Design a protein around this ligand. Structure first.
Ligand SMILES: Nc1nc2c(ncn2[C@@H]2O[C@@H]3COP(=O)(O)O[C@H]4[C@@H](O)[C@H](n5cnc6c(=O)[nH]c(N)nc65)O[C@@H]4COP(=O)(O)O[C@H]3[C@H]2O)c(=O)[nH]1
Ligand SMILES: [Ca+2]
Lengths: 175, 175
């Protein structure tokens, strides 16, 4: 199962490096980067995990209610982005949000003939990736409390699905 | 097992992106420095796969007979390095050389208590990583032709080990 290595390297090579400093980066941003009406950025890295492995280049193109706000300021450099979440036209939250990049590997594999990797195989591995990553984070209490995995399967009636709503459900659980 | 996910992401997320442009970058370098260089930088990416997963801070300290020459010049930027290989005190080869980065993941896991990942596990996974990567490369002859895997273990009897000789043995099968 490719998901095992994908989850482990995502943790070892990214999450365990970025998460320990995230709380401070967000606090600093909230306290030091002045824009009159900007809302407080929520703590935690919110990670989108579509089980279909469909990762857009433009996160806001997946949902007009997810609006880019700013880059989270920074020994290496990590690009993280802050977004406002809208609900019925109003600002309902502000958070640090991104797709789980290893899902792009699963998607690319499914499009690569020689991989012998079907859409069915991909869905199995996407589920396994989420499970494996959850188990890793459960054993790392610090990293666990600094991120939230948002795993979802999209309904056939896409008019009944809102990516912003999915993020808001998780964000509001912390409140 | 983590090995095959590590191999697939290394291919999908790095090798398949860098390899198609490598020959042109090396050719350009060879043209630019044709007056200085007595013998041309070899084509192909030579990837070091120490099965002990020991990836030192830089090639340089692994072998006095491997010496840094220059960065290979030139969306996503890639850092690759050119080294000279010495034999009998003379420059015997010049090539683009680098450790397989996913071996770092395996090393880190073995040092991470919660992974339950022993030295025995690590070695087995390193071997599986190499086998899987070789198999992936064999189905992408284009990529296969553009790189060479150099897998090795250091002697158990603690006789001397020459990394340069490993690389030269491979480099000389092309010529
Ligand atoms: N959102 C986010 N995600 C990140 C970041 N850094 C790493 N990741 C995610 O974590 C995966 C594993 O990173 P890795 O352990 O460094 O494992 C890497 C590394 O071993 C190797 N690799 C990637 N880029 C390079 C490179 O420029 N040079 C070399 N030598 N190896 C590379 O291939 C493996 C897989 O690369 P990826 O497919 O990109 O897969 C990445 C990617 O999905 C980040 O700054 N932000
Ligand atoms: Ca639909």
């Amino acid at each position: 199962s490719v998901a095992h290595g994908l989850a482990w390297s995502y943790y070892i090579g990214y999450l365990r490096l970025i998460l320990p400093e995230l709380q401070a980066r967000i606090r600093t941003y909230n306290q030091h980067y002045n824009n009159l009406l900007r809302g407080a950025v929520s703590q935690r890295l919110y990670i989108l995990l579509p089980l279909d492995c469909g990762v857009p280049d433009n996160l806001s193109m997946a949902d007009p209610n997810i609006r880019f706000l700013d880059k989270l300021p920074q020994d290496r450099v990590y690009s993280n982005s802050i977004y406002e979440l809208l609900e019925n036209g109003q600002r309902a939250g502000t958070c640090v949000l991104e797709y789980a990049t290893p899902l792009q590997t699963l998607f690319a594999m499914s499009q690569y003939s020689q991989a012998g990797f079907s859409r069915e195989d991909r869905l199995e591995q996407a589920k396994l990736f989420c499970r494996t990553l959850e188990d890793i984070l459960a054993d790392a209490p610090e990293s666990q409390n600094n991120c939230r995995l948002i795993a979802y399967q999209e309904p056939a009636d896409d008019s009944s699905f809102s990516l912003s709503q999915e993020v808001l459900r998780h964000l509001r659980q912390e409140e």
